[PDB]
Amino acid sequence: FLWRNRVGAEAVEVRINHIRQGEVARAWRFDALAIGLRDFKADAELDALAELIASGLSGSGHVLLEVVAFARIGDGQEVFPSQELILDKGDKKGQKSK
Amino acid sequence: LSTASVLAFERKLDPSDALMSAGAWAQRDASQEWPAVTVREKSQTVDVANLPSDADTLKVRFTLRVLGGAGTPSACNDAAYRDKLLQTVATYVNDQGFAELARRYAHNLANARFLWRNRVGAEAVEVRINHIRQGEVARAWRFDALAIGLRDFKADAELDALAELIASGLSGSGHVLLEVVAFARIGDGQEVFPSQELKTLYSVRDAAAIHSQKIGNALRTIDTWYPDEDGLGPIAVEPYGSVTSQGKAYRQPKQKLDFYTLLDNWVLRDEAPAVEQQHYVIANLIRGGVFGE
Amino acid sequence: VRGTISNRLKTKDRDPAKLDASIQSPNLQTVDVANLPSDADTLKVRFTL
Amino acid sequence: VAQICDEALQYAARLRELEPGWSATPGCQLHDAEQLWLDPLRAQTDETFLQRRLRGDWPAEVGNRFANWLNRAVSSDSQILGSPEAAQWSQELSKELTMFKEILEDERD
Amino acid sequence: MAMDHYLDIRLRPDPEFPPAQLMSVLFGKLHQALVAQGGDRIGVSFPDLDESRSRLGERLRIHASADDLRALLARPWLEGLRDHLQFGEPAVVPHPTPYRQVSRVQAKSNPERLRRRLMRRHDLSEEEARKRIPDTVARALDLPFVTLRSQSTGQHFRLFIRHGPLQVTAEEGGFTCYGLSKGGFVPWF
Amino acid sequence: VTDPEALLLLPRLSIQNANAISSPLTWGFPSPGAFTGFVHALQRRVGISLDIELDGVGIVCHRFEAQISQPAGKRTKVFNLTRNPLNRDGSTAAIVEEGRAHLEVSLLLGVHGDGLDDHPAQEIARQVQEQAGAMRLAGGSILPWCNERFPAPNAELLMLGGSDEQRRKNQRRLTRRLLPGFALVSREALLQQHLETLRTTLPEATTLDALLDLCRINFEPWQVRDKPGWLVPIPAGYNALSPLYLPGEVRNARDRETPLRFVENLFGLGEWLSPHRVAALSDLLWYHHAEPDKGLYRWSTPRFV
Structure with missing residues (x-):
C-alpha cells in the first residue's frame, strides 16, 4: 500500500492491531524485508490474521484493523502522497502544476 | 516500427532540500546545536543571508540516496x-x-557546486559525507583543500571505494544513504544566497534553503x-x-x-x-x- | 479519483485493442467524500420527529 | 470546421475593438493567457520588460485551447477510425491547429 | 599608457548564470584589489565592454606596471576562481602604449538622492522638488558593468563603467588607490 | 482585367444615408455596381493626374442597419421615410417611399499605375484617401473623419512584386486588419451548376434566386437542409433590351454627347464570406464590362475561387 515509499527504503516494519473496543485486542509485528512482494508464502504469525479476516469477510464476528507501516526512508526525503486533478483557476504562481 | x-x-539520486545555519570551524565534532539563518524583512525590501561574528562558517544539512534499477x-x-x-x-x-559515471558523480560530490552563489569567496571548503544504511554511521569521511576543483576532477586512494559504493548502490547490490554537508567560512557581511521563489528566497521553516531539483543540478554535471x-x-x-x-x-x-x-x-x-x-x-x-x- | 473502464462493454464491439486504448485516456472525476475526524470513532445523527 | 475556426477569428476581431481597458483586473487569471488573441491596450504600469505579462507574444497555448475545443467538440470513439475518414478527423483537427498557429503566429505582436 | 606589465583573465563556462553578477563581483573585487590594499602603480578597466551593446564582456584585463604588476595577480585576493578559470603570465608591455582607461563613471538623476537632500534640508512637499527636477536632465543609465551583489536594492541595476580620452601617448601621472584615470594614461587597450 | 500591381485598403469607410433598395426586388446591402461606379469616378478625379487605373472593388460590410420597422408584429417590415417639402398648392407633397440605410464598408481596389514607379507610396495613398471623402457612393454622404481616423492611414500594399512567402504574408498582413466583416463575392458558376443540377423539375431561369431566400425542406415522411452559406439574390448587371439611341433622338438625357439605352435589372446571387476562406485577395474583385452586341451591361467577379 506504500506505492513508491516502500521501494528504495532501507527497512520497513508494520504494526497491525485488532480493535475489539477502545483498546488493543491482539498485536502483530511484521517485516516486509523477510516476506516478498512477488510470492505469497505461508507464514507463522499472520495465518491467524488470515483466519481473522476470513471470519470477518463471512460476518462471523467483525474486525476493525489498524494497519500501520514504519518505513525508514531517510531524514528529510521526499514522500509521495497522491495527486489531484487540477482546475485551471491558478495563475503562474498559486499551485498550478501539481 | x-x-x-x-x-x-x-529519478534516482534523490536528494533532500538543504536547510542552512552558521557555525564554528573546528566544530564538526559536535555540530548539532546551531541556529539557522533567520530571514528578516526590512526597508523595496531585500534579503540578506547574514552570518554571526562568533560563528562565521556555514552548515548545510541535506541527504542523498539511490533507488537503483x-x-x-x-x-x-x-x-x-x-x-x-x-x-x-x-x-x-x-x-x-558505469564506474566512470560513479567517478563523475563522486566528483560532483567532491566539489561544493551545490551552493551556487554561496560557494564563491570563502576561506576553505571541506565537503563531508557519510555511509548510512541504518541510524549508526559506517565509515566517516573528510575532504581536502587541493582536491576541491571548480571544474577539475581526480581520483584518490580513499575516494575510489566511495566511487564503487555509489556504483554498487546504483547497480542494485545494497542501497545506502549519504548525508551531505560542506564547510564555507565565507565571511561576516556576505549575502551568500540559496535558491529563491518566484525577491523571495526559499525559506524552509525558520531558516533558508535550496530546492532539491536545483541541488540535483550540481550533482549531475x-x-x-x-x-x-x-x-x-x-x-x-x-x-x-x-x-x-x-x-x-x-x-x-x-x-x-x-x-x-x-x-x-x-x-x-x-x-x-x-x-x-x-x-x-x-x-x-x-x-x-x-x-x- | 480515476479508474479503469469497468463498464460491461457491449460485445457488438468488445475488442482488446480498444481495451488497451481506453487506459491512457483516464477518467477525469473529482468526487466528494465524508470521513470521520481521525481522532474519533463514532457517528452521531440527530433529528426531530 | 475551418469555417467555425473562421467564426472564432471573427469573434476575436469583434472582441478586438470593444476593449478600452485591457490589463490585469478582477477576473483575469485565465484571461492573462486568454488575452493573447484578445490583445488589450498597452499597460502603462509595465516597465521596460513589458513583453511578458502585458505584452505576451506567446500564442502557443492557443494551440492548446484549439486542442481542447477539438477534443470537446465531438467525442472521438476508440473504434470510429476503421475507414480513412476517422483518423482523418484528427488530420483535419491538425490542419485546423496549423491554421490557428499561422493565424496566432503574430497575435500579441 | 604607463604600464610595464599585465595579466590576462577570462572565466570559464558553467551552468549557473550569466556575467551580470559576475561583472558586479568583478567590480567589487577590483575595488578590493586596487582599493582594499592601496597602491597607484596599477591599471584597472573593462575595455571589453559594449556601451553600444548594453553588456559587460566575457574577458578581463586587470594588469599594472612592471614592478607593481609583477607580484600582484598571483594571490587569493581574487581567489575562488582558480579551478574553472586561469590567470595570465609575466609578459612585457608594447612599444606603443594605448593611453586610455575606464574607471567608476555614472550619474544619479532620481528624486531620492537629490530630492532626498531637497526634502531633508528644504523640507517641502513634491511641488518644488518636481518643479526643480525635470524629466530631461537624467534617466536610467547603461554603463559598462552589470548588477552588483549589494543588498541595498534587490534586483540588479546599472553598473559603473564609462570611458574617457583615448590617446596613444604616455601618461606619466601616477594614479590613485583605485587603478582609475585622473587625466593621464593607464594600461588599457 | 488583371490582378493588380498593388492593393489599396481604406479600413473604416463609414458612410451614411445610403440607398437600401437599389433594385425593385431587394432592400438590403446596395448594388456592387454602385461601388464600381464609385471607383470609376475616383479614377476620373484622381488617376488622370496621378496615372493609376482602377478595375475592381472589394466589399467587406462591417456593420449594417436599416431604417426599418415592424408593423404590429406581422411577418413583414416597413421603411422609415423623410418628409418631402411643401407642394405648390401647400397642403402636402406626393409622398414617395424609398429605403435609406447607414452601413459600414472598406474598399480594396486594383491598380495598374505608378504608385511606386515614379511617385512615392503613402503620398499617393494619403492623397487618394484624403480626396475620397468628398463624394457620394450609394446616394449617401460618407461620414467623415472622426475618432475612426486613428486607424485610417494605410499602406499601399503591393501584390505583383515580392517574395512568394511574403506575397502570402503581405496579403494576410492585409487580412489582419479586416476581421469582423464578411466579404461579398459572386457565385456565377454556382448559379450555373445549381440551376442546371436542379433542372429535374423545370428549366426556368428566373426561378433560381426566386427559390433560395427561404428555408427549402423536403421533411420527414424535423431536419433543416444543409445551407451552403447565405443564399441571397443580388442585382448582377443590366440587360439593355431596346437598341441604342442618340442625344438628339431621345431628348432629356443627362449629357447631350453620350448615347442612351433603356435598361432592365438582372439577378444573380452573392454569397457572404469571411476573408479567411478565400484563395487570394486579388480573386474577389467586382470588375466591369459592357457587351453592346448583347444587351448585357454586366459586372462580375472573375475567378472568385
Missing part, C-alpha cells in the same frame, strides 16, 4: 520495447560498468561530449542540454548525436555511440522525464 507513446522513469521503466506503454530496454541497459552495465567542444567543461545532463548561463542550445538538434535522435537508433537500429556519449545517455536516463511521443 515505433517506440512507446507514453514512457517515463523514476535504472533499467526498469516507470511506465512504459508497449511490450516489445521493455524486454529489449532491460537487456540493453543490463548488458550495457555488464558490457561496460556530467555531459562533456556535446559535439562543439569540451574545453568549457561538462554540463548538467538533460535532453537538448542547455543552460541559462551559456544561453545557447548545446546539443543542437540537427545532428545524429542528440539524445532523442540516437536513442531510438540505439534501441531499434542499434547505433552504438562511444563510451563517453553513453555516460550522457545513462546520466539523463537516471534523471527520468516524460518521454516517448
Whole structure:
C-alpha cells in the first residue's frame, strides 16, 4: 500500500492491531524485508490474521484493523502522497502544476 | 516500427532540500546545536543571508540516496520495447560498468557546486559525507583543500571505494544513504544566497534553503561530449542540454548525436555511440522525464 | 479519483485493442467524500420527529 | 470546421475593438493567457520588460485551447477510425491547429 | 599608457548564470584589489565592454606596471576562481602604449538622492522638488558593468563603467588607490 | 482585367444615408455596381493626374442597419421615410417611399499605375484617401473623419512584386486588419451548376434566386437542409433590351454627347464570406464590362475561387 515509499527504503516494519473496543485486542509485528512482494508464502504469525479476516469477510464476528507501516526512508526525503486533478483557476504562481 | 507513446522513469539520486545555519570551524565534532539563518524583512525590501561574528562558517544539512534499477521503466506503454530496454541497459552495465559515471558523480560530490552563489569567496571548503544504511554511521569521511576543483576532477586512494559504493548502490547490490554537508567560512557581511521563489528566497521553516531539483543540478554535471567542444567543461545532463548561463542550445538538434535522435537508433537500429556519449545517455536516463511521443 | 473502464462493454464491439486504448485516456472525476475526524470513532445523527 | 475556426477569428476581431481597458483586473487569471488573441491596450504600469505579462507574444497555448475545443467538440470513439475518414478527423483537427498557429503566429505582436 | 606589465583573465563556462553578477563581483573585487590594499602603480578597466551593446564582456584585463604588476595577480585576493578559470603570465608591455582607461563613471538623476537632500534640508512637499527636477536632465543609465551583489536594492541595476580620452601617448601621472584615470594614461587597450 | 500591381485598403469607410433598395426586388446591402461606379469616378478625379487605373472593388460590410420597422408584429417590415417639402398648392407633397440605410464598408481596389514607379507610396495613398471623402457612393454622404481616423492611414500594399512567402504574408498582413466583416463575392458558376443540377423539375431561369431566400425542406415522411452559406439574390448587371439611341433622338438625357439605352435589372446571387476562406485577395474583385452586341451591361467577379 506504500506505492513508491516502500521501494528504495532501507527497512520497513508494520504494526497491525485488532480493535475489539477502545483498546488493543491482539498485536502483530511484521517485516516486509523477510516476506516478498512477488510470492505469497505461508507464514507463522499472520495465518491467524488470515483466519481473522476470513471470519470477518463471512460476518462471523467483525474486525476493525489498524494497519500501520514504519518505513525508514531517510531524514528529510521526499514522500509521495497522491495527486489531484487540477482546475485551471491558478495563475503562474498559486499551485498550478501539481 | 515505433517506440512507446507514453514512457517515463523514476529519478534516482534523490536528494533532500538543504536547510542552512552558521557555525564554528573546528566544530564538526559536535555540530548539532546551531541556529539557522533567520530571514528578516526590512526597508523595496531585500534579503540578506547574514552570518554571526562568533560563528562565521556555514552548515548545510541535506541527504542523498539511490533507488537503483535504472533499467526498469516507470511506465512504459508497449511490450516489445521493455524486454529489449532491460537487456540493453543490463548488458550495457555488464558490457561496460558505469564506474566512470560513479567517478563523475563522486566528483560532483567532491566539489561544493551545490551552493551556487554561496560557494564563491570563502576561506576553505571541506565537503563531508557519510555511509548510512541504518541510524549508526559506517565509515566517516573528510575532504581536502587541493582536491576541491571548480571544474577539475581526480581520483584518490580513499575516494575510489566511495566511487564503487555509489556504483554498487546504483547497480542494485545494497542501497545506502549519504548525508551531505560542506564547510564555507565565507565571511561576516556576505549575502551568500540559496535558491529563491518566484525577491523571495526559499525559506524552509525558520531558516533558508535550496530546492532539491536545483541541488540535483550540481550533482549531475556530467555531459562533456556535446559535439562543439569540451574545453568549457561538462554540463548538467538533460535532453537538448542547455543552460541559462551559456544561453545557447548545446546539443543542437540537427545532428545524429542528440539524445532523442540516437536513442531510438540505439534501441531499434542499434547505433552504438562511444563510451563517453553513453555516460550522457545513462546520466539523463537516471534523471527520468516524460518521454516517448 | 480515476479508474479503469469497468463498464460491461457491449460485445457488438468488445475488442482488446480498444481495451488497451481506453487506459491512457483516464477518467477525469473529482468526487466528494465524508470521513470521520481521525481522532474519533463514532457517528452521531440527530433529528426531530 | 475551418469555417467555425473562421467564426472564432471573427469573434476575436469583434472582441478586438470593444476593449478600452485591457490589463490585469478582477477576473483575469485565465484571461492573462486568454488575452493573447484578445490583445488589450498597452499597460502603462509595465516597465521596460513589458513583453511578458502585458505584452505576451506567446500564442502557443492557443494551440492548446484549439486542442481542447477539438477534443470537446465531438467525442472521438476508440473504434470510429476503421475507414480513412476517422483518423482523418484528427488530420483535419491538425490542419485546423496549423491554421490557428499561422493565424496566432503574430497575435500579441 | 604607463604600464610595464599585465595579466590576462577570462572565466570559464558553467551552468549557473550569466556575467551580470559576475561583472558586479568583478567590480567589487577590483575595488578590493586596487582599493582594499592601496597602491597607484596599477591599471584597472573593462575595455571589453559594449556601451553600444548594453553588456559587460566575457574577458578581463586587470594588469599594472612592471614592478607593481609583477607580484600582484598571483594571490587569493581574487581567489575562488582558480579551478574553472586561469590567470595570465609575466609578459612585457608594447612599444606603443594605448593611453586610455575606464574607471567608476555614472550619474544619479532620481528624486531620492537629490530630492532626498531637497526634502531633508528644504523640507517641502513634491511641488518644488518636481518643479526643480525635470524629466530631461537624467534617466536610467547603461554603463559598462552589470548588477552588483549589494543588498541595498534587490534586483540588479546599472553598473559603473564609462570611458574617457583615448590617446596613444604616455601618461606619466601616477594614479590613485583605485587603478582609475585622473587625466593621464593607464594600461588599457 | 488583371490582378493588380498593388492593393489599396481604406479600413473604416463609414458612410451614411445610403440607398437600401437599389433594385425593385431587394432592400438590403446596395448594388456592387454602385461601388464600381464609385471607383470609376475616383479614377476620373484622381488617376488622370496621378496615372493609376482602377478595375475592381472589394466589399467587406462591417456593420449594417436599416431604417426599418415592424408593423404590429406581422411577418413583414416597413421603411422609415423623410418628409418631402411643401407642394405648390401647400397642403402636402406626393409622398414617395424609398429605403435609406447607414452601413459600414472598406474598399480594396486594383491598380495598374505608378504608385511606386515614379511617385512615392503613402503620398499617393494619403492623397487618394484624403480626396475620397468628398463624394457620394450609394446616394449617401460618407461620414467623415472622426475618432475612426486613428486607424485610417494605410499602406499601399503591393501584390505583383515580392517574395512568394511574403506575397502570402503581405496579403494576410492585409487580412489582419479586416476581421469582423464578411466579404461579398459572386457565385456565377454556382448559379450555373445549381440551376442546371436542379433542372429535374423545370428549366426556368428566373426561378433560381426566386427559390433560395427561404428555408427549402423536403421533411420527414424535423431536419433543416444543409445551407451552403447565405443564399441571397443580388442585382448582377443590366440587360439593355431596346437598341441604342442618340442625344438628339431621345431628348432629356443627362449629357447631350453620350448615347442612351433603356435598361432592365438582372439577378444573380452573392454569397457572404469571411476573408479567411478565400484563395487570394486579388480573386474577389467586382470588375466591369459592357457587351453592346448583347444587351448585357454586366459586372462580375472573375475567378472568385
